[PDB]
Coordinates of C-alpha atoms in Angstrom, one line a residue:
Chain A
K8 CA -148.6 -4.8 -76.8
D9 CA -148.3 -0.7 -76.0
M10 CA -144.5 -1.5 -74.8
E11 CA -144.0 -2.6 -78.4
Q12 CA -145.8 0.2 -79.7
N13 CA -143.1 2.3 -77.9
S14 CA -140.5 0.8 -78.8
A15 CA -141.4 0.7 -82.2
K16 CA -142.5 4.5 -82.3
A17 CA -138.9 5.7 -80.4
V18 CA -136.7 3.2 -82.4
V19 CA -137.5 5.0 -85.7
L20 CA -136.7 8.5 -84.6
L21 CA -133.3 6.5 -83.0
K22 CA -132.8 5.4 -86.9
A23 CA -133.2 8.4 -88.5
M24 CA -130.2 10.2 -86.1
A25 CA -128.2 7.8 -85.9
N26 CA -125.9 8.4 -88.6
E27 CA -123.3 11.0 -88.6
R28 CA -124.6 12.8 -91.6
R29 CA -127.8 13.2 -90.0
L30 CA -127.0 14.0 -86.3
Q31 CA -125.7 16.6 -87.9
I32 CA -128.0 18.6 -90.0
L33 CA -130.7 18.0 -86.5
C34 CA -127.9 19.2 -83.9
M35 CA -127.0 22.5 -86.1
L36 CA -131.3 23.0 -86.6
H37 CA -131.2 23.3 -82.4
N38 CA -133.5 26.3 -81.7
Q39 CA -132.2 27.4 -85.7
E40 CA -134.2 27.5 -88.7
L41 CA -132.0 27.2 -92.0
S42 CA -132.0 26.7 -95.6
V43 CA -130.9 23.6 -97.9
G44 CA -127.7 26.9 -98.8
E45 CA -127.4 27.4 -94.9
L46 CA -126.8 23.6 -93.9
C47 CA -124.8 23.3 -97.2
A48 CA -121.7 25.8 -96.8
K49 CA -122.4 25.2 -92.7
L50 CA -122.1 20.8 -93.4
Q51 CA -119.1 20.3 -96.9
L52 CA -121.8 18.3 -98.2
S53 CA -123.3 18.3 -101.8
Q54 CA -126.2 19.0 -102.6
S55 CA -127.9 15.3 -103.8
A56 CA -126.5 13.7 -100.9
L57 CA -127.8 16.5 -98.6
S58 CA -131.6 16.0 -99.8
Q59 CA -131.7 13.1 -99.8
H60 CA -130.7 13.1 -95.7
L61 CA -133.5 15.8 -95.7
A62 CA -135.4 13.5 -96.9
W63 CA -134.9 10.7 -94.5
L64 CA -135.8 13.0 -92.3
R65 CA -138.8 14.7 -92.9
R66 CA -140.2 11.2 -93.8
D67 CA -139.5 9.9 -90.1
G68 CA -141.2 13.8 -89.0
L69 CA -137.7 15.4 -87.5
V70 CA -138.4 18.6 -89.3
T71 CA -140.8 20.1 -90.2
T72 CA -140.0 22.5 -94.6
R73 CA -140.9 26.4 -94.5
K74 CA -141.4 27.4 -98.6
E75 CA -139.6 31.7 -98.9
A76 CA -141.3 31.6 -102.6
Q77 CA -138.4 28.5 -103.8
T78 CA -135.5 28.6 -101.4
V79 CA -137.0 26.1 -98.4
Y80 CA -136.5 25.6 -94.9
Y81 CA -135.1 23.3 -92.7
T82 CA -136.8 23.4 -88.3
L83 CA -137.0 20.6 -85.9
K84 CA -140.2 18.7 -85.5
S85 CA -141.3 16.8 -83.0
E86 CA -140.6 18.3 -79.1
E87 CA -139.5 14.4 -79.4
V88 CA -136.4 15.5 -81.5
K89 CA -136.5 18.8 -80.4
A90 CA -135.7 17.5 -77.0
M91 CA -132.9 14.5 -78.3
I92 CA -131.5 17.7 -79.4
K93 CA -131.4 19.6 -76.9
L94 CA -129.6 17.0 -74.7
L95 CA -126.6 15.7 -77.5
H96 CA -126.3 19.8 -77.5
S97 CA -125.3 19.6 -74.0
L98 CA -123.2 17.0 -74.1
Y99 CA -121.6 16.8 -77.1
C100 CA -122.1 19.8 -78.7
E101 CA -120.7 22.1 -75.4
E102 CA -123.7 23.9 -74.9
Chain B
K8 CA -112.0 17.5 -86.8
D9 CA -113.5 17.6 -82.9
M10 CA -117.4 17.5 -85.8
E11 CA -116.4 14.2 -86.6
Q12 CA -115.5 12.7 -83.0
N13 CA -118.3 13.1 -81.2
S14 CA -119.8 12.7 -83.9
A15 CA -119.0 9.5 -84.1
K16 CA -119.7 9.0 -80.7
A17 CA -123.0 10.2 -80.1
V18 CA -123.9 8.0 -83.5
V19 CA -122.3 4.4 -81.8
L20 CA -124.2 5.5 -78.7
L21 CA -127.8 6.2 -80.1
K22 CA -126.8 2.8 -82.8
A23 CA -126.5 0.7 -79.7
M24 CA -130.5 2.2 -79.0
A25 CA -131.4 2.5 -82.3
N26 CA -133.3 -1.6 -81.6
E27 CA -136.4 -2.8 -80.3
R28 CA -134.9 -5.5 -78.0
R29 CA -131.8 -2.9 -76.9
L30 CA -134.3 -0.7 -76.7
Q31 CA -136.1 -2.2 -73.9
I32 CA -133.6 -3.1 -72.1
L33 CA -131.4 -0.2 -71.2
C34 CA -134.9 0.9 -69.9
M35 CA -135.9 -1.5 -67.9
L36 CA -132.6 -0.4 -66.2
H37 CA -133.0 3.2 -66.0
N38 CA -132.6 2.9 -62.2
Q39 CA -132.0 -0.5 -61.4
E40 CA -130.0 -3.2 -61.5
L41 CA -130.7 -5.9 -62.9
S42 CA -129.9 -10.5 -63.4
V43 CA -129.7 -12.3 -66.9
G44 CA -132.8 -14.3 -65.9
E45 CA -134.7 -11.3 -64.4
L46 CA -134.5 -9.5 -68.0
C47 CA -135.0 -13.0 -69.4
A48 CA -138.9 -13.3 -67.7
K49 CA -139.5 -9.5 -68.3
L50 CA -139.0 -10.0 -72.2
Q51 CA -139.5 -13.2 -73.8
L52 CA -136.1 -13.8 -74.9
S53 CA -133.8 -16.2 -76.0
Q54 CA -131.4 -16.4 -73.0
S55 CA -129.4 -16.5 -76.4
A56 CA -130.2 -14.2 -78.5
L57 CA -130.0 -12.1 -75.2
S58 CA -126.9 -12.7 -74.4
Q59 CA -126.0 -11.0 -77.6
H60 CA -128.3 -7.8 -77.0
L61 CA -126.0 -7.8 -73.7
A62 CA -122.6 -8.3 -75.3
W63 CA -123.6 -5.9 -77.9
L64 CA -124.7 -3.3 -75.3
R65 CA -121.5 -3.7 -73.3
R66 CA -119.1 -4.1 -76.0
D67 CA -120.1 -0.2 -76.3
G68 CA -120.3 0.4 -73.3
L69 CA -124.0 1.6 -72.8
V70 CA -124.1 -1.3 -69.7
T71 CA -121.2 -2.6 -66.7
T72 CA -121.4 -5.4 -65.1
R73 CA -120.8 -7.3 -61.5
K74 CA -121.4 -11.3 -60.6
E75 CA -122.7 -12.8 -57.5
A76 CA -121.0 -16.0 -57.7
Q77 CA -121.8 -16.4 -60.8
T78 CA -124.9 -14.8 -60.8
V79 CA -124.8 -11.4 -63.1
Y80 CA -125.9 -7.9 -63.0
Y81 CA -126.7 -5.7 -65.6
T82 CA -126.6 -1.5 -65.0
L83 CA -126.4 1.0 -67.3
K84 CA -122.8 2.9 -67.4
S85 CA -122.8 6.2 -69.1
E86 CA -124.1 9.4 -68.2
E87 CA -124.4 10.0 -71.4
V88 CA -127.0 6.9 -71.4
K89 CA -128.3 7.4 -68.4
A90 CA -129.4 10.7 -69.2
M91 CA -130.6 9.7 -72.3
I92 CA -133.0 6.3 -70.7
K93 CA -134.0 9.0 -68.5
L94 CA -135.3 11.0 -71.2
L95 CA -137.0 8.5 -73.5
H96 CA -139.0 7.7 -70.0
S97 CA -140.8 10.0 -70.0
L98 CA -141.7 10.6 -73.3
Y99 CA -142.9 7.0 -74.1
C100 CA -142.5 4.6 -70.6
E101 CA -145.2 7.3 -68.9
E102 CA -142.3 8.1 -66.6

């Protein structure tokens, strides 16, 4: 019943974070709002591939956007992902 | 440098948890030591497939074992996974 529904909900979030590039994006958005350009410069990633990771994180509800006429700013969306990144940040990001 | 080493270390742990069955096993081991039989009865899983999940979790350092002459008892191993399950438990396991 709920065991398979909650397990699925959590797995969706875990699968979205179980990627080196996707995790680095989320960790950078910890208590911070960044644009596509700011992420591109801080990650050495092509815009085409960076847009693919952002699309995956957006489709699964891990990040939400805000536009400043054409510039898109990204930020962590769900409280579950915010708590997940906060804990991971202290375990691996030295803070 | 460390960015790709720490990201890899965290991804290994996230990939191990990004599975409905593997996550249910870890959640059951939260502050609890259980044998193979106790897990088999509480999860409706075949012993062959349950041993495969336990082997994956063991190889990646998420669980460690203890034997009582022939009975194997499982428990969460790393402090990182213990903190991860503790947070997930409060977000989805209602406690």
